[PDB]
A paper describes a structure:
TRPA1 is a non-selective cation channel localized on the plasma membrane, which exhibits permeability to various cations, including sodium (Na+) and calcium (Ca2+) ions. TRPA1 is homotetramer; each subunit is composed of six transmembrane α-helices (S1–S6), two pore helices (P1, P2) between the helices S5 and S6, and the large intracellular N-terminal and C-terminal. Four identical subunits interact with each other to form the central ion permeation pore, below which the coiled coil (CC) is located.
Crotalphine (CRP), a 14-amino acid peptide, has been demonstrated to specifically activate TRPA1 and elicit potent analgesic effects. The 3D structure of the human TRPA1 with crotalphine binding was determined at a resolution of 3.8 Å. However, the limited resolution of the electron density map in this region prevented unambiguous modeling and refinement of the crotalphine ligand. Structural alignment revealed that the coiled-coil domain and the cytoplasmic ankyrin repeat domain remain stationary, while the transmembrane region of the complex undergoes rotation and displacement relative to the stationary domains. Simultaneously, elongation and straightening of the S4–S5 linker and the S5 α-helix result in an upward shift and rotation of S5. Specifically, the pore diameter of the lower gate expands from 5.4 Å to 6.7 Å, while the upper gate widens from 8.1 Å to 9.3 Å. In the crotalphine-bound structure, the S1–S6 helices do not undergo the complete rotational transition seen with iodoacetamide binding, and the S4–S5 linker fails to adopt the fully extended conformation observed in the iodoacetamide-bound state. Based on these observations, we propose that the captured complex conformation likely represents a transitional intermediate along the gating pathway.
Numbering used by the authors:
A (entry chain A): 561 to 645, 654 to 667, 679 to 745, 767 to 790, 802 to 1009, 1039 to 1078
B (entry chain B): 881 to 960
C (entry chain C): 802 to 880
D (entry chain C): 961 to 1009, 1039 to 1078
The structure:
């Protein structure tokens, strides 16, 4: 640090090295700390960042390398970017993008290196809030409004006309639903959520189809039911998307995998216990047919049936023929199978939810910046060039990996020094005046 | 409640516990609350072939009694 | 492992069910065997369908499942 | 939940182990004709169709450092044992 600082205090030109590696690039590549501290501290940083590197992507922008390699240095730099007085001022101008470069290039760099201490840094948080309240909130509100433009008339019309058939209020509702569905189709044209909205939009298309050609009533009403139910589910999805954190969509994949496993395990256990109960309790009327048995055992797992009269009372009158077997099936199905299945399912859910509670906890900012860059890239330049802001004011009234890493570098320096010293001492013996004790 | 309410309304209009959308939302409120007779209300009409949407109604039933509450309790217990 | 004794259960019971091909067997025993055989048949087939997947975590936790069931089938009776 | 967490770690690292186990058992209990016929060597895939070893490294580096320092100390002892201490004798 002393060498670089002393050189910079004097005239010491900064130039390309024909490898597209500036002196700052070399300082950062070698993971050096005090030199980068003395270059942030000292002046001429505007000039040092000015030279940049734009030809060979082998050495990227200085800010991106700064993010990737030394996090604490950018922590100090952003601390210097924060201003106090409590007139808190955010200087910006160090997160800036120079117009393969993405709009939020520094943010993408910091979220693809999981440097959480910099994502939760106050300046980046305010930057995200500024971008949100500038354009992201407006765009998301526009999307939700275009969706509600189809949601509201669907509910109104389903409440209006009694199902079971194939005054201008109906026509207005139908035309609103058609235009909203077509607009959403266009939006999607321009993950599980994707197939979900494809389901909803296809079903809305089926519901609006009798505007063109005749469709049977029963199919129309089946489509209407599935469409309304999925409409409200999707709107709950969007209302969750209102919140910045998207943990719910993250765990929705776990939800759907658990549902896929359950919708087959439950059917198979229904079938198994169905024939078991059929051959076991044939003497009674609720098991006369195998179909009756599977439906009634479906009721048994569903949660409502009278155990006393159906099972236990016939035992006392000795009208039942398999006491041990029937009681074994009863205990195994009511307090052995559901308890174990709930234990297994809760264990799987808790493990995956803990995994999410860590990964999505460090990736909330990542998904936020992801949707922000996607929105900016798919949006024209007029809006961004008009709303873009640089200054903000906030009023009060309105842990071991890097330490072991540091130890490793210090020990490497120590062993280099000791090797040099040993070579030096060998130099000492190789020319000595050994005469008195020769 | 609202979603499953209209779903049950348009799905089970043939019966009396879904005559009005208000009746449907209140009775489905009862369904999530925890006390209602499933046998007579749903399964028995299937055998006499008085119901018109077997697959859809059974899908709604399974999704609301052993697919939605299980997943919601799992999610809530995980967060807690 | 538990799967071995499980399939031994199923195969023995299937043998009892096919026994009246050779010699006469009382009907009640035959139907008891049929019930246990069918129920274990479907349970074993669910086991195999899980074995379809590469990961065998379910069979791994099945030992925990059976130990919990062994504790419960006595604690519940005693209570 | 305790046992399921234990499984979610052990079986997570042992899924591949049980897979290879059943594969070797199947291969050993199968004749050689099928394997000698189906055995393949090449495959193509198309896109469209953390602290134990660091402390261990530190331990080896420190062992090397202390060996070097022991040798250097012996060397310096060699330096004293033959010296021309006359001016300050």
């Amino acid at each position: 640090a002393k060498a670089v600082a002393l050189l910079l205090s004097h005239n010491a030109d900064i130039v390309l090295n024909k490898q597209q590696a500036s002196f700052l690039h070399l300082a950062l590549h070698n993971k050096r700390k005090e030199v980068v501290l003395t270059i942030i501290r000292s002046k001429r940083w505007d000039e040092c960042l000015k030279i940049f590197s734009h030809n060979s992507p082998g050495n990227k922008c200085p800010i991106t390398e700064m993010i990737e390699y030394l996090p604490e240095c950018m922590k100090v730099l952003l601390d210097f970017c924060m201003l106090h007085s409590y007139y808190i001022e955010y200087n910006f101008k160090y997160l800036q993008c120079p117009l393969i470069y993405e709009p939020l290039t520094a943010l993408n760099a910091m979220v693809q290196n999981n440097r959480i201490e910099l994502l939760n840094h106050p300046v980046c948080k305010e930057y995200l809030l500024m971008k949100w309240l500038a354009y992201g909130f407006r765009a998301h509100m526009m999307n939700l409004g275009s969706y509600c433009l189809g949601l509201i008339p669907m509910t109104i019309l389903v409440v209006n006309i009694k199902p079971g058939m194939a005054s201008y209020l109906i026509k207005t509702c139908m035309i609103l639903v058609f235009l909203s569905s077509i607009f959403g189709y266009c939006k999607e044209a321009g993950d599980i959520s994707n197939v979900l909205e494809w389901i909803i939009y296809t079903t809305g298309i089926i519901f609006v189809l009798p505007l063109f050609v005749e469709i049977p009533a029963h199919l129309q009403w089946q489509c209407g039911a599935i469409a309304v139910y999925f409409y409200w589910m999707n709107f709950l999805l969007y209302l969750q998307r209102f919140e910045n954190c998207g943990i719910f969509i993250v765990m929705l994949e776990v939800i759907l995998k658990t549902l896929l496993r359950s919708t087959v395990v439950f059917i198979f256990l229904l079938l198994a216990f169905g024939l078991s109960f059929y051959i076991l309790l044939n003497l009674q009327d609720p098991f006369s047919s195998p179909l009756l048995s599977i439906i009634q055992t479906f009721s048994m797992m569903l949660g409502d049936i009278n155990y006393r009269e159906s099972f236990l009372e016939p035992y006392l009158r000795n009208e039942l023929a398999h006491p041990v077997l029937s009681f074994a099936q009863l205990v195994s199905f009511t307090i052995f199978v559901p308890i174990v299945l709930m234990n297994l399912l809760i264990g799987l859910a808790v493990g995956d939810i803990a995994e999410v509670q860590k990964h999505a906890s460090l990736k909330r900012i990542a998904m936020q910046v992801e949707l922000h860059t996607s929105l900016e890239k798919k949006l024209p330049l007029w809006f961004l060039r008009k709303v873009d802001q640089k200054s903000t004011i906030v009023y009060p009234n309105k842990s071991l990996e890097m330490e072991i890493l540091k130890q490793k570098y210090r020990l490497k320096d120590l062993t280099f020094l000791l090797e040099k010293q040993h070579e030096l001492i060998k130099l000492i013996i190789q020319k000595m005046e050994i005469i008195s004790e020769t």
